[PDB]
Amino acid sequence: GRMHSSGKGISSSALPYSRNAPSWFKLSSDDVVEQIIKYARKGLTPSQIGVILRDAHGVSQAKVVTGNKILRILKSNGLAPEIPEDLYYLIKKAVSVRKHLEKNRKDKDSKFRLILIESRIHRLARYYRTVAVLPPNWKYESATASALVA
Amino acid sequence: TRTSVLADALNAINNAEKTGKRQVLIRPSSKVIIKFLTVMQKHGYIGEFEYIDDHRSGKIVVQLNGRLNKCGVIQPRFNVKINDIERWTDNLLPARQFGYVILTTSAGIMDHEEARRKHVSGKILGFVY
């Protein structure tokens, strides 16, 4: 594991066996959906919406209680981000690294890490284009990337 | 990365067998793995085996009875014509009187003697003796 490192960590979430909501869950699918929409409109990524639901609303999984994953529900209400969240975060990290690099030209380790980050950006964008999530001519560019995360 | 679940399954079986174990865990499971195990079990080379559901690829526990000398895959799954089964049997099996080359044919996964009875051929999949 670790595409761009030699680490072999296995830490992960272990999803529970039962696919149904627990008996102590009482909120309805509509309540959870409108809660998701409320948090999304408030400015939260699907990962962070899932975190809030788990941490304060007894929602172990959106799928088990609502029948759908957070991004699918989010797309069905015209609230899916124009760039997928993981690609956006990779781009944002590249932008920050490149600002640091233009401010610190002798940081060779940061130059190496920038190469790694941008390689992941390119591989992920290739995947998103090949499944029609991104436009066919979509193409990450260092000069213009400060305008997406802007 | 994992490139052949059947290879891992049969390797784990061999490593348990040579150490004198009577049981072995397999992960992941697959339909091909189950069919290969069923062919092995039919000829008496393994005991029963039990599939463990985990809402994932599955796991299998296999019972071993000490009669297995070696099982293994052939990788690639070479295309085998009917007249080329004999060379694979000569190459892979200890003797002419026992052992099996396991094939995947359009008629299903079978040993080479069943393939010779039904006059069918496919790809080579593994062996057992």
Binding site: - | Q75, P76, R77, F78
Partner: protein
Amino acid sequence: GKGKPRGLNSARKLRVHRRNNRWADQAYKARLLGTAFKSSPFGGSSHAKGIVLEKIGIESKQPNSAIRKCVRVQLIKNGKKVTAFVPNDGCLNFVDENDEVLLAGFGRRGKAKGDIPGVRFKVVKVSGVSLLALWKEKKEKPR
């Protein structure tokens, strides 16, 4: 495992890899470079005729101590100058300057034989008659 590709669609890699590595095989490389045709004294033949240019005695290698009786020869077909060796005690006296000898290799395929430094060919005939007959007097040298 094993460091060679095993895929069912990997035939081109295996074929080209074998083709590259046979160049390390001396016999195959000599054959496909055409060294016998372009650089061998005989041009790739089994035998060749020549003219004797002189006589030479070559000191044998250690641990032996002798004087091997050899002639300097220029071949008819290409004018190359080669050193040949005459077998059989009493046959340097059967060869003279400006005689036409027929040569052959020593059987070691272009290598030197025995204790004889830097000599690759053996005289077979002189003036149209074989050394074996002249040694055994079955025939006499025509002059």
